[PDB]
Amino acid sequence: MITPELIPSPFAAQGDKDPIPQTSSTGFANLRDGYTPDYEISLASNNPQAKAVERKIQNQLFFIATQNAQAWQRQMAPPWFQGMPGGYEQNAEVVRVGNDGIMRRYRSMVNANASDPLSSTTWEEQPAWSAMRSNIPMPAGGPGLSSGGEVITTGRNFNDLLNGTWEFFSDSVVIASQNAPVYPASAGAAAGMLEAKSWISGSNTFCVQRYTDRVGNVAVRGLNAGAWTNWMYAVNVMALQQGRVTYGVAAGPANAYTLTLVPQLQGGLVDGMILRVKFNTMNTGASTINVSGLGAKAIVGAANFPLTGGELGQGLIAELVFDAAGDRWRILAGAPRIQV
Amino acid sequence: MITPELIPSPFAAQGDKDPIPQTSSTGFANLRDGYTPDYEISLASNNPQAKAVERKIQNQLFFIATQNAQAWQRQMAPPWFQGMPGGYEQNAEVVRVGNDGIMRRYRSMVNANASDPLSSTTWEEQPAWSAMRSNIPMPAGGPGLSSGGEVITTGRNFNDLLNGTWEFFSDSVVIASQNAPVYPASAGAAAGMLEAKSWISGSNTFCVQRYTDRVGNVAVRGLNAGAWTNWMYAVNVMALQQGRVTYGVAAGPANAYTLTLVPQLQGGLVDGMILRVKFNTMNTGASTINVSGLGAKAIVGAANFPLTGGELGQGLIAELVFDAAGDRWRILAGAPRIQV
């Protein structure tokens, strides 16, 4: 850390200057010999090549040194010079006037790189750090440029979660998060990341966010017309093996032997929902049971007879299904077609 | 821009240059004082301390500047130097050329560290933008340096995707794009992003295609040998409660009942597959039942009464499955049998 002085203009910027050659003829300046020793010789002594210190050469030498320092201060990188002799070793970094005069860092991939970086595929153009933060499909910590915030101490609420790897740090604190992405019968989300991405179709915004919690359920929700739809939670093979969706314990006191459905039918009931209905006591008769708390259907027999006698009994599991036209509990197992 | 035109070579770098000492007790051109006041005495004074201006020092002075300038021009970063006084400050970078010969830029991750950058963990190697863009395993828009192409412009085949995720700003683009899957409880994909990550094991481009919509319906597949495999869709909880895929309604020809299912039934004939069917009419004779038109086979139950009539009550589902090797439907659930 040493700070040079601001070079406003190189020395002898608008002064007479002469080009310093590489080869010598007489007691003249060079670039390999520089000031010649042999014809260094007494200038006021009538000697053949007797030379004097050259104002033009020394002024241009100072001009060159000051120009290099000035360009170093401003652009931090030598401009790539057209067909410079000697070539470029690979991984060399330069910046030079681009197509528009807009310039970016260029790094060469080949030795003896004689091609101009604007015309070279070997020279690769290197933009800034925002280009990395864009190249990641979702920036860590949301729009936040720094990685800090990618893991969140308090469960990041999903009322504004649209993008970014908002990793969730403490499961207990995420239990308090609203719009919790956990399958039903679970209170709140656990620790884990959210692959969340958002893309704008004009004024409207479409986005989706997926998230695997500690337990393992994969919850993915998408914004619909400016409002997030409730998460979809992956049906795990343990979930299917449990079969909690299609069965419950028997509930309801009279003319109803409903099952408290955990989980209940999301999005209502449409056609032929199958439930292995439990009856800890014998069915009363035409039972208008409120399965899932919203589907209220009256059970009638498959033989168009009431199920009061012998069809449904106590301590029973018997699968009952909807009717599309009837919206009634037709039997799939347990209540038979009685002989008479 | 200010263009410090490249000097072909340093000044006097084949001739003579006496090194510049740090201090000179004899009052010569040192570094602490530069040109000493002794270089100001008149030489005609007959003062011995009057030092005439030598050029070996002049040549070395000009050579230092010219060589530093050309190193800046031709190799960007300063070469690392053995034992820099004070080591190197934090975030200071140099280039320590390796045995390979390529320039190896190194950043100082440790304050005031003097460790040899070639064999230093502190002197971290500064990789190329290609290295960073390859170090991200899921790059948007393939391998491009730009992050553009997040949302696909039009309906285009997902075969172009190799490794990365792409958003979808148009609900038209998801359907119109080739290889658009048949979503659960939907015609096609909603406007949600899709990931296709295919490791290029030559012709065995092992791929994963994670497709997700607004509601959270999820789908996957993978490409191989010039063709993508089937689409695996993760089951829904909302779909799991209803069981719409397993549920079905019989249709088609009389007593040769087929089925139409949303989403379409796949997998063909597999050992012991559920055939749930609202029979469109009451059977009066030889009755055959199948789902998705897989195959019309006779139904045999526990009592083994033949195809006579009433075995398939109209609209009565029956969660029956066909014998794996018998090629005949075994009634499983909801068996309506009238006495004939």
Next chain:
Amino acid sequence: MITPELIPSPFAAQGDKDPIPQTSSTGFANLRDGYTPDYEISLASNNPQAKAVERKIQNQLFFIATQNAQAWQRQMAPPWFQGMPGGYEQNAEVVRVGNDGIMRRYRSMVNANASDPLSSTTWEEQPAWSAMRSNIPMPAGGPGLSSGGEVITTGRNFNDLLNGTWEFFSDSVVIASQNAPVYPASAGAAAGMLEAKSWISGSNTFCVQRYTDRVGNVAVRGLNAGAWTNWMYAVNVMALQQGRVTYGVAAGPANAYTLTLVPQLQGGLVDGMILRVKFNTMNTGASTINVSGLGAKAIVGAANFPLTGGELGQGLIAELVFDAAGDRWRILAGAPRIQV
């Protein structure tokens, strides 16, 4: 390779120096004109403009050159010169003194940016690849900084790898390696990508690891207390379509039946859980069935009492349910009824 020897201290560091005048009316070593033509007349002629080369002017010139060169050699880059003529053009990464004490590189993005790097949004950092990659949840090579190591042809240990993406060049070498997922209706994991990442959680820092195989059937799992949870093989909608996962072909000897299927029914028999099991032969009386060794319970009919026989045909697939209080499995449908 051009390595201009280390500059320990600039020329005329603590010596006398004359700040070069920017422009001089009477030609006096000004920057605009350099050494003006009046620095060439003989001093003996006594003409008024007989200037001589000033020691302090020469000292200041060489000081500027050596100071800039040494700053480049040590800190890689010029400092941020406040009061910069014309601000800083686009892509200008000045090294800036830290308020804390670390040197920090801020790049001006906008042409002629003129605000202080610390207190401006225009200046953006260009940090090292370490803190840079910290923004990637899933870095290539996992822990490895380089892109390599992500793909291992050999069946590397699944336990030791904790973060990053793992690709296996061979699909079956995943099964050869430990902790390979067993997808439904699939022997083992196919050739897919494993995304694994570990977050701090306080006492038990936790990681999520999911393998998405080539077909797409995903296995989400969670490293619990350093021990991974068994892979969660997401059942897909065509697994629901086939119904094979829930289907079972129970061993058919009379009065004793054994039930098992892969993927395993975790938890075995559950209160009010039903399974579709094929009994090949008849059963004379109260039979037996169990899953996973939780408990073997008797098999009966709709009367819930030991069966009489004739309630099942050759190869009858039956839905057997288990209730907590009854502790019995009964042929719910497809069963003739007899009262005990």
